[PDB]
Amino acid sequence: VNSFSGYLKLTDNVYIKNADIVEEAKKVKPTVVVNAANVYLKHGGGVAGALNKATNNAMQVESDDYIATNGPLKVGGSCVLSGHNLAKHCLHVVGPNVNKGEDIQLLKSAYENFNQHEVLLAPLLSAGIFGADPIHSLRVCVDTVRTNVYLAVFDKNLYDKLVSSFL
Ligand SMILES: O=C(N[C@H]1c2cccc(O)c2C[C@H]1C(=O)O)c1ccc(NCC2CC2)nc1
């Protein structure tokens, strides 16, 4: 049993809700919150910009030190950093950004990072300002992630479409 409330069970291991991931994280304090990161960990907008703002920019400060030491992530890759006031840990995952021309096949590799964590609160990867089809992202999630994932979807009309079209 866990404290995630009002989630729609899609499969054995994937759950979804129309909710603000910032508020879900503040309320649940999950072991892992996933960030929709880029390779430079520059948390400018979307999920990344939103989570960073909720940490009062502490996520960005930590991220800048990470990049200065380690260099950029790979598209499809990830790193584990602090969850600050939102979670124990933040798993920064880089899905492909279609608005940068990145290959959508890398979306499966991106979701594979979730399998290293037994339970996660996460956004649908490559949705919103990353420009990929969210119905596609949800399908890849269900077909790739085997651990227990709670997807928080910000946009109500996207959530309604994701529920209505899920096979
Ligand atoms: O950009 C957000 N979401 C979309 C997005 C963007 C980039 C990559 C992604 O994979 C996704 C999933 C999309 C969605 O979930 O609709 C978002 C989410 C929460 C939030 N909270 C603070 C506001 C003040 C209440 N702000 C923004």
mmCIF file of C-alpha atoms and ligand atoms in Angstrom:
data_model
loop_
_atom_site.group_PDB
_atom_site.id
_atom_site.type_symbol
_atom_site.label_atom_id
_atom_site.label_comp_id
_atom_site.label_asym_id
_atom_site.label_seq_id
_atom_site.Cartn_x
_atom_site.Cartn_y
_atom_site.Cartn_z
ATOM 1 C CA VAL A 1 0.000 0.000 0.000
ATOM 2 C CA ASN A 2 1.157 3.590 -0.727
ATOM 3 C CA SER A 3 -0.237 7.127 -0.214
ATOM 4 C CA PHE A 4 -0.833 8.108 -3.868
ATOM 5 C CA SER A 5 -4.498 9.161 -3.894
ATOM 6 C CA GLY A 6 -7.165 8.931 -6.623
ATOM 7 C CA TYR A 7 -4.958 7.359 -9.304
ATOM 8 C CA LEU A 8 -6.520 5.460 -12.226
ATOM 9 C CA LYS A 9 -4.896 2.017 -12.543
ATOM 10 C CA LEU A 10 -4.104 1.570 -16.285
ATOM 11 C CA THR A 11 -2.144 -1.682 -15.970
ATOM 12 C CA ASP A 12 -0.634 -3.897 -13.283
ATOM 13 C CA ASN A 13 2.029 -1.239 -12.613
ATOM 14 C CA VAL A 14 1.042 2.091 -14.273
ATOM 15 C CA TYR A 15 -1.328 4.625 -12.690
ATOM 16 C CA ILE A 16 -2.432 8.050 -13.894
ATOM 17 C CA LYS A 17 -4.124 11.174 -12.531
ATOM 18 C CA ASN A 18 -4.958 14.703 -13.701
ATOM 19 C CA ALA A 19 -2.750 16.508 -11.194
ATOM 20 C CA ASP A 20 0.089 19.005 -10.713
ATOM 21 C CA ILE A 21 3.278 16.959 -10.153
ATOM 22 C CA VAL A 22 4.604 19.809 -7.932
ATOM 23 C CA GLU A 23 1.617 19.416 -5.580
ATOM 24 C CA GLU A 24 1.652 15.606 -5.713
ATOM 25 C CA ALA A 25 5.331 15.689 -4.737
ATOM 26 C CA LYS A 26 4.778 18.218 -1.934
ATOM 27 C CA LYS A 27 1.903 16.116 -0.561
ATOM 28 C CA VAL A 28 3.298 12.591 -0.991
ATOM 29 C CA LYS A 29 7.038 13.304 -0.593
ATOM 30 C CA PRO A 30 7.774 10.280 -2.781
ATOM 31 C CA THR A 31 11.090 8.479 -2.697
ATOM 32 C CA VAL A 32 11.562 9.493 -6.358
ATOM 33 C CA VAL A 33 10.108 12.319 -8.442
ATOM 34 C CA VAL A 34 11.050 12.295 -12.127
ATOM 35 C CA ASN A 35 12.047 15.527 -13.843
ATOM 36 C CA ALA A 36 11.601 16.110 -17.582
ATOM 37 C CA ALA A 37 15.215 17.227 -17.931
ATOM 38 C CA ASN A 38 17.453 18.276 -20.798
ATOM 39 C CA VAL A 39 21.085 17.223 -21.232
ATOM 40 C CA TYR A 40 22.385 20.467 -19.657
ATOM 41 C CA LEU A 41 20.021 20.254 -16.664
ATOM 42 C CA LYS A 42 18.898 23.792 -17.558
ATOM 43 C CA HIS A 43 15.448 23.789 -15.908
ATOM 44 C CA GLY A 44 13.905 26.627 -17.951
ATOM 45 C CA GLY A 45 10.259 25.674 -18.568
ATOM 46 C CA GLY A 46 7.651 22.913 -18.354
ATOM 47 C CA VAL A 47 8.016 20.214 -15.685
ATOM 48 C CA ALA A 48 11.713 21.118 -15.201
ATOM 49 C CA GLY A 49 11.060 24.862 -14.863
ATOM 50 C CA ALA A 50 8.078 24.124 -12.589
ATOM 51 C CA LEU A 51 9.873 21.739 -10.207
ATOM 52 C CA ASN A 52 12.927 24.003 -10.048
ATOM 53 C CA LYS A 53 10.773 27.012 -9.120
ATOM 54 C CA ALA A 54 9.180 24.980 -6.319
ATOM 55 C CA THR A 55 12.701 24.332 -4.906
ATOM 56 C CA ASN A 56 13.471 28.090 -4.902
ATOM 57 C CA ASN A 57 16.198 27.399 -7.540
ATOM 58 C CA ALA A 58 18.063 24.911 -5.308
ATOM 59 C CA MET A 59 17.559 22.236 -7.982
ATOM 60 C CA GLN A 60 19.289 24.480 -10.544
ATOM 61 C CA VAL A 61 22.211 25.248 -8.206
ATOM 62 C CA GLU A 62 22.768 21.540 -7.542
ATOM 63 C CA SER A 63 22.386 20.754 -11.243
ATOM 64 C CA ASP A 64 24.967 23.346 -12.290
ATOM 65 C CA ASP A 65 27.515 21.730 -9.961
ATOM 66 C CA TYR A 66 26.624 18.286 -11.386
ATOM 67 C CA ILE A 67 27.223 19.456 -14.971
ATOM 68 C CA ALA A 68 30.441 21.272 -14.079
ATOM 69 C CA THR A 69 31.792 17.995 -12.662
ATOM 70 C CA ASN A 70 30.321 15.412 -15.048
ATOM 71 C CA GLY A 71 29.373 17.161 -18.279
ATOM 72 C CA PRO A 72 26.029 16.800 -20.051
ATOM 73 C CA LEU A 73 23.730 13.827 -19.908
ATOM 74 C CA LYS A 74 22.854 11.753 -22.976
ATOM 75 C CA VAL A 75 19.444 11.975 -24.634
ATOM 76 C CA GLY A 76 17.728 8.889 -23.206
ATOM 77 C CA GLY A 77 19.887 9.055 -20.066
ATOM 78 C CA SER A 78 19.397 10.123 -16.479
ATOM 79 C CA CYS A 79 21.004 11.052 -13.200
ATOM 80 C CA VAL A 80 19.848 10.891 -9.582
ATOM 81 C CA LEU A 81 20.090 14.126 -7.588
ATOM 82 C CA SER A 82 18.395 15.472 -4.474
ATOM 83 C CA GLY A 83 14.638 15.828 -4.372
ATOM 84 C CA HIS A 84 15.005 18.945 -2.191
ATOM 85 C CA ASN A 85 11.644 19.840 -0.598
ATOM 86 C CA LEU A 86 9.714 17.689 -3.102
ATOM 87 C CA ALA A 87 10.964 14.116 -2.693
ATOM 88 C CA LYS A 88 13.908 12.145 -1.329
ATOM 89 C CA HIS A 89 15.478 11.983 -4.796
ATOM 90 C CA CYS A 90 14.896 13.529 -8.204
ATOM 91 C CA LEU A 91 15.537 11.282 -11.201
ATOM 92 C CA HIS A 92 16.394 13.705 -14.013
ATOM 93 C CA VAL A 93 15.470 11.873 -17.236
ATOM 94 C CA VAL A 94 16.166 13.235 -20.721
ATOM 95 C CA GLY A 95 13.505 12.287 -23.227
ATOM 96 C CA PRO A 96 14.021 13.302 -26.859
ATOM 97 C CA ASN A 97 12.881 16.836 -27.706
ATOM 98 C CA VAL A 98 11.106 16.769 -31.077
ATOM 99 C CA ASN A 99 11.482 20.598 -31.265
ATOM 100 C CA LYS A 100 15.260 19.973 -31.331
ATOM 101 C CA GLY A 101 14.831 17.246 -34.032
ATOM 102 C CA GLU A 102 15.779 14.392 -31.645
ATOM 103 C CA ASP A 103 14.881 10.791 -32.498
ATOM 104 C CA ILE A 104 11.657 9.624 -30.824
ATOM 105 C CA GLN A 105 13.014 6.018 -30.667
ATOM 106 C CA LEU A 106 15.110 7.325 -27.774
ATOM 107 C CA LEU A 107 11.895 7.593 -25.755
ATOM 108 C CA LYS A 108 12.027 3.888 -24.857
ATOM 109 C CA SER A 109 15.611 4.261 -23.587
ATOM 110 C CA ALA A 110 14.481 7.246 -21.509
ATOM 111 C CA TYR A 111 11.693 5.248 -19.849
ATOM 112 C CA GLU A 112 14.065 2.342 -19.106
ATOM 113 C CA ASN A 113 15.670 4.571 -16.454
ATOM 114 C CA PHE A 114 12.456 4.256 -14.426
ATOM 115 C CA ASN A 115 13.091 0.501 -13.964
ATOM 116 C CA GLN A 116 15.950 1.278 -11.560
ATOM 117 C CA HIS A 117 13.401 2.553 -8.989
ATOM 118 C CA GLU A 118 10.652 0.490 -7.390
ATOM 119 C CA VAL A 119 8.132 3.370 -7.193
ATOM 120 C CA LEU A 120 8.153 6.782 -8.933
ATOM 121 C CA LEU A 121 6.032 9.896 -9.375
ATOM 122 C CA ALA A 122 6.599 10.995 -12.905
ATOM 123 C CA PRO A 123 5.442 13.092 -15.823
ATOM 124 C CA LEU A 124 4.667 11.530 -19.189
ATOM 125 C CA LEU A 125 8.031 11.761 -20.970
ATOM 126 C CA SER A 126 8.518 14.031 -24.027
ATOM 127 C CA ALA A 127 5.003 15.550 -23.759
ATOM 128 C CA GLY A 128 4.182 19.268 -23.571
ATOM 129 C CA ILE A 129 7.015 21.499 -24.871
ATOM 130 C CA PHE A 130 9.118 18.414 -25.826
ATOM 131 C CA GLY A 131 6.693 18.003 -28.778
ATOM 132 C CA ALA A 132 6.159 14.218 -28.890
ATOM 133 C CA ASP A 133 2.729 12.540 -29.082
ATOM 134 C CA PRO A 134 1.604 12.028 -25.427
ATOM 135 C CA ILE A 135 -0.663 9.139 -26.404
ATOM 136 C CA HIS A 136 2.523 7.658 -27.839
ATOM 137 C CA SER A 137 4.515 8.495 -24.730
ATOM 138 C CA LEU A 138 1.937 6.758 -22.529
ATOM 139 C CA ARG A 139 2.057 3.656 -24.731
ATOM 140 C CA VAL A 140 5.863 3.520 -24.542
ATOM 141 C CA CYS A 141 5.652 4.000 -20.768
ATOM 142 C CA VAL A 142 3.244 1.087 -20.320
ATOM 143 C CA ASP A 143 5.298 -1.136 -22.650
ATOM 144 C CA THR A 144 8.678 -0.252 -21.064
ATOM 145 C CA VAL A 145 8.313 0.521 -17.355
ATOM 146 C CA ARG A 146 7.897 -2.528 -15.121
ATOM 147 C CA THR A 147 8.208 -0.767 -11.767
ATOM 148 C CA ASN A 148 5.326 1.101 -10.148
ATOM 149 C CA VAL A 149 4.824 4.477 -11.817
ATOM 150 C CA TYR A 150 2.333 7.191 -10.860
ATOM 151 C CA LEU A 151 1.950 9.575 -13.802
ATOM 152 C CA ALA A 152 0.724 13.071 -12.927
ATOM 153 C CA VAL A 153 -0.732 14.886 -15.977
ATOM 154 C CA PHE A 154 -0.935 18.698 -15.692
ATOM 155 C CA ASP A 155 -3.263 19.502 -18.625
ATOM 156 C CA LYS A 156 -6.881 18.412 -18.004
ATOM 157 C CA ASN A 157 -7.727 18.128 -21.697
ATOM 158 C CA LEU A 158 -4.619 16.010 -22.293
ATOM 159 C CA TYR A 159 -5.622 13.775 -19.358
ATOM 160 C CA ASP A 160 -9.145 13.353 -20.750
ATOM 161 C CA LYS A 161 -7.682 12.358 -24.149
ATOM 162 C CA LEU A 162 -5.169 9.943 -22.557
ATOM 163 C CA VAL A 163 -7.942 8.165 -20.619
ATOM 164 C CA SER A 164 -10.371 8.077 -23.574
ATOM 165 C CA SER A 165 -7.800 6.641 -26.014
ATOM 166 C CA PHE A 166 -5.947 4.144 -23.810
ATOM 167 C CA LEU A 167 -5.923 0.621 -25.167
HETATM 168 O O1 LIG B 1 4.787 21.557 -18.370
HETATM 169 C C1 LIG B 1 4.147 20.887 -17.627
HETATM 170 N N1 LIG B 1 3.548 19.624 -18.076
HETATM 171 C C2 LIG B 1 3.692 19.125 -19.454
HETATM 172 C C3 LIG B 1 5.155 18.816 -19.837
HETATM 173 C C4 LIG B 1 6.198 19.682 -20.160
HETATM 174 C C5 LIG B 1 7.447 19.162 -20.487
HETATM 175 C C6 LIG B 1 7.677 17.788 -20.503
HETATM 176 C C7 LIG B 1 6.652 16.912 -20.186
HETATM 177 O O2 LIG B 1 6.950 15.537 -20.231
HETATM 178 C C8 LIG B 1 5.380 17.421 -19.850
HETATM 179 C C9 LIG B 1 4.039 16.712 -19.462
HETATM 180 C C10 LIG B 1 3.005 17.805 -19.714
HETATM 181 C C11 LIG B 1 1.771 17.644 -18.812
HETATM 182 O O3 LIG B 1 1.860 17.021 -17.716
HETATM 183 O O4 LIG B 1 0.661 18.142 -19.157
HETATM 184 C C12 LIG B 1 3.893 21.338 -16.169
HETATM 185 C C13 LIG B 1 3.485 20.434 -15.192
HETATM 186 C C14 LIG B 1 3.252 20.909 -13.905
HETATM 187 C C15 LIG B 1 3.426 22.264 -13.644
HETATM 188 N N2 LIG B 1 3.161 22.744 -12.283
HETATM 189 C C16 LIG B 1 3.242 24.181 -11.977
HETATM 190 C C17 LIG B 1 1.973 24.955 -12.416
HETATM 191 C C18 LIG B 1 1.699 26.245 -11.643
HETATM 192 C C19 LIG B 1 0.812 25.019 -11.418
HETATM 193 N N3 LIG B 1 3.799 23.109 -14.593
HETATM 194 C C20 LIG B 1 4.029 22.679 -15.826
#
